[PDB]
Amino acid sequence: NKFKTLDKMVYNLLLEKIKNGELVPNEHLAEEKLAREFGVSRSPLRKAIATLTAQGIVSYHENSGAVLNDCIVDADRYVQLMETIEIFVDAAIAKAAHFGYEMDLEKLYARMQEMERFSYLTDLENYFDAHHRFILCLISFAENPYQVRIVKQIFFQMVHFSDGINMFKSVEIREWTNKKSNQIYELLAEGKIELARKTIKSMFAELTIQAYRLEHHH
Template sequence: MNKGTVYKTRTQMVADILREKILSGEIVAGEPLRQDALAKEFNVSRIPVREALLQLEAQGLVSFEAHKGATATQLLPAEIHELFGLRALIECHVLECAIDKMTDQDLETAREVLLAFEKAVESGTQVETWSDLNYALHAALYKPAAMPMAMEVIHSLNIKSDRYIRLQLLLTAGIDKAEEEHCELLALCQKRDKAAASALLKKHILEAGQAIHDLLIQQQATRPAL
């Protein structure tokens, strides 16, 4: 946690810290999130902990089960295909709408995010920054479409897939592939080539999902039996 961070509420503090722990993998999928223990850890009452967990449930990062309480959500390999398929479906549509409305300033903003992404990758540290900038680039390209409800759905789907994208960037060759495809995608947007840009984006998202699916299958195969 950044020591300089100032939180408006205890609920926000707990939610932000737990979100980062879940997305970074410090809290693993399926791990129980016990309210009493969390309240003690954060030196707060159970109320802000409960509210924070409900926020994270709405973002798809926490689930509540009867007689079990809250746990960090776990995406099964089969669910990866559905999640990334939904992303491809809506993001390609929004990108096509955005290209018609892109200004030179919109493209420059996306280019600046791309340069920040490349710089962060070259640093070799802080994978959370890679993931944040990866989403920021996509969001910059979609913004001209002016479709706020669609962007809410896209943001939600990206939060659910974020920790798995981090796994892909860290443990596969995904980071080099992402850089190359981001550059190509921006170039196609500059040419206003909607068909080619949409096709590349679909390939970009679905192949990332497949890589993550394969990684999860591999992890399951090598995980010791309990």
Template sequence: MEKQSYEKKAYETMKEKILNGQLRTGDRVPENTIAKELGISRTPVRRALVMLETEGFLTIESNRGAFVCESKVTVGRFIEMLEMLEVLTIKTMDKIETKGISFEPQHLYRRLSVMEGHLKAGNSSGFVEEGWQTIFDFIAYMGNSYANNAVRKMGIDFLTKAPKEIILIPFHNGAYLIEQYMRMNELLRTKDFDKAETIVRELVNYFIIKTFR
């Protein structure tokens, strides 16, 4: 196995442990244990730790090691994220409509198919990560670097700094989420932008209500 593959394996293993709660906020990442578990040296593990720190999953302290970042996404912050995504999604739809941008529904269908697979398999972390990537891919149609960076940052914050009960909200309502995405995708394909925007607003309101239940 090549060095890059070792790093990727270490990266994916540690990231999964963080997302599924095996490594919790404030936990020190057991560098030696990870290396032994994967049958590799500590060097690719250390490189993977740097990658995870860059993405906001960890903080690395000199002479102390790497620690899982403190959770900072509260219910209030989650609702702010939902409202921001509503604004950005509708603005993206407006730009697709007014600028005549070519929308490719098949790409979104493929993303939703992957999400559905994660949902059926009970893979909550895979489902949520794919969901954020789906949002990012759609916002990219706007062609606005600020919007792209904002969504990327929100996704990283959500995955790394939200408590598990908030992270699981999309997964627990996954069937409904996929159904509404499918409807939205079909409406965009047929250029019925007003109805597509209505679905976005209803979807955000739905998740705000679910957050308080």
């Protein structure tokens, strides 16, 4: 909509072809036809494809070319992604508490407050991003950048291929999630680690229930 480079544009263009469904999973990407459609040379397009192969969205095979993977995320896949996120979060908190690391709780407070702010402003995309950044801060408490990057990739896939953000169209759900995030921050700051972990688990369980309620009656 408001691009600054030819590469990212093409990337975004291709990405939207993956989201609106103009390219179906298991389809071989016609790199030559795609470059003609965008009016671009193959140097940007190729680059885009490479990036989307790094994100697991496209798979290149030695026998065919680049193939597009099944990337659409229904409720069950959303819950699988959330289970991955939650094992990462719980293990992060457990490791930090066991080894006595210093948790950047001020950054976590800032992230929770950004959640509060975007919920007050009714900025849904920024609220989703802020919720994700709060979770990422929790995970970074493990001091494992590999895990942070993995969960960032998961968040990217959720944002671009799930309707999970629609859950936060409810002000009630947004405020409950903000309250849970603040409770987690407070328990961590007070040192009640097991209570914080069970609060994290409760948060994820309720959001899983709501993810399944998204599919039942939207």
